[PDB]
């Protein structure tokens, strides 16, 4: 199957692999072609990071379709999202799609001192509920500029 790896500058790296091939084998081929060390690479599929030691088949990737991945460097960090407060101050958070809503509220408390029980987080009109992850709402690396509303 063909893989297409989209980078942050708009480049597309092409590979041809088997479904038994591991993620870390794909990073290895990106290293040879771009000089980016394997340990600096994060490969994102549908907004979610693929983990080493798994085959592509273990992610339920359909091998008759073209696989489209995003390359993000560890140096870029996690998702940078924005939270606007009761007053309208914008703050910056760095999260992962596997973070829970309470993890997210904990971070807001770390930066702003708002107890998590006082925090109501809304995403584009939908309240984000405790007990869920960002992923559950499909908040993941595909959202390039995400804004949450506080009250």
């Amino acid at each position: 199957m063909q893989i297409f790896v989209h980078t942050d500058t708009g480049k597309t790296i092409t590979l041809e692999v088997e479904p038994s091939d591991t993620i870390e084998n794909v990073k290895a081929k990106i290293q040879d072609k771009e000089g980016i060390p394997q340990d600096q690479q994060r490969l994102i599929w549908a907004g979610k990071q693929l983990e080493d030691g798994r085959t592509l088949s273990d992610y339920n990737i359909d091998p008759q379709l073209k696989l489209h991945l995003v390359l993000r460097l560890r140096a870029a960090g996690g998702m940078q999202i924005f939270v606007t407060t009761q007053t309208g101050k914008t703050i910056t958070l760095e999260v992962e799609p596997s973070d829970t809503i309470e993890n997210v509220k904990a971070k807001i408390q770390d930066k702003e001192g708002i107890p998590p029980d006082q925090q109501r987080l809304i995403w584009a009109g939908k309240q984000l509920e405790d007990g869920r992850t960002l992923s559950d709402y499909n908040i993941d690396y595909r959202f390039l500029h995400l804004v949450l509303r506080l009250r």
Partner: protein, 274 residues
């Protein structure tokens, strides 16, 4: 020996075929035409040639690269001799979707629908959302060449969006096919006035469905002086407010608006005398 006239170049993006056509030379007793197609990048060994009979006025070239300029030259041939050529340039394109439409539109999601293109060079499609006012990219994804449907979520109420689908080939892409979407914040309904004393009244309304708002905005004034308008901000989880310090025997006009951050719904208005 006169060249041909009226050279036309047709690079069909849907089939990938370049059709070269011309008007036959006025010179008597020509023995054919020679057609060359060459990228104008100065790369040697990439030139393509066709030769056709004197009664032929077209030729084709397959597998040209999108985004690369080619020069096409047509020579009138008469035995040993050739004319000065007629020439022109052309840059083939990647086909772009033609029937992209919005479907299955809900308060919290919009569906993108299109017919997948029938070319084997297509490797997939890129879907982008951009807030049109500030030009901020909001969302990006990539899908396989067989996919003809996508669900876009996360559009802020009140914001205008450019939503584009881009056809991808190996080493190329089309111009974006773009739609715009803006979903207004829905108003409250069913405005009612109770507990009406001489200087006070209770205002109640029904909230809009299926949106978590930042707040409600209540505007109220005597009918005979709009310039005396007062305002209160109401919690988005509350559906009532008690107005106090009102003028007696005076009809007030009252409006309630839904608010999502900076954006308001159309106002819910009513009038009520104290």
């Amino acid at each position: 020996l006169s060249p041909p006239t009226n050279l036309h170049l047709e690079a069909n993006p849907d089939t990938g075929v370049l059709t070269v056509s011309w008007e036959r030379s006025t010179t008597p007793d020509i023995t054919g035409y020679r057609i060359t197609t060459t990228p104008t990048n100065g790369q040697q060994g990439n030139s393509l040639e066709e030769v056709v009979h004197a009664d032929q006025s077209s030729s084709t070239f397959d597998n040209l690269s999108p985004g690369l300029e080619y020069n096409v030259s047509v020579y009138t041939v008469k035995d040993d001799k050739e004319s000065v050529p007629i020439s022109d340039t052309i840059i083939p394109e990647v086909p772009q979707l033609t029937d992209l439409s919005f479907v299955d539109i809900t308060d919290s999601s919009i569906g993108l629908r299109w017919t997948p293109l029938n070319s084997s060079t297509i490797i997939g499609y890129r879907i982008t959302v951009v807030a049109a006012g500030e030009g901020i990219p909001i969302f990006e994804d990539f899908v396989d060449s067989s996919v003809g449907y996508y669900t876009v979520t996360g559009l802020e109420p009140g914001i205008d969006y450019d939503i584009s689908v881009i056809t991808l080939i190996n080493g190329g892409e089309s111009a974006p096919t773009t739609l715009t979407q803006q979903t207004a914040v829905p108003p409250p309904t069913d405005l009612r006035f109770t507990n009406i004393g001489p200087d006070t009244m209770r205002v109640t309304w029904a909230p809009p469905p299926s949106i978590d708002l930042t707040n409600f905005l209540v505007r109220y004034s005597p009918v005979k002086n709009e310039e005396d308008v007062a305002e209160l901000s109401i919690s988005p989880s509350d559906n009532a407010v008690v107005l106090t310090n009102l003028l007696p025997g005076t009809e007030y006009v009252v409006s309630v608006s839904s608010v999502y951050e900076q954006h308001e719904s159309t106002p819910l208005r009513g009038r009520q005398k104290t």
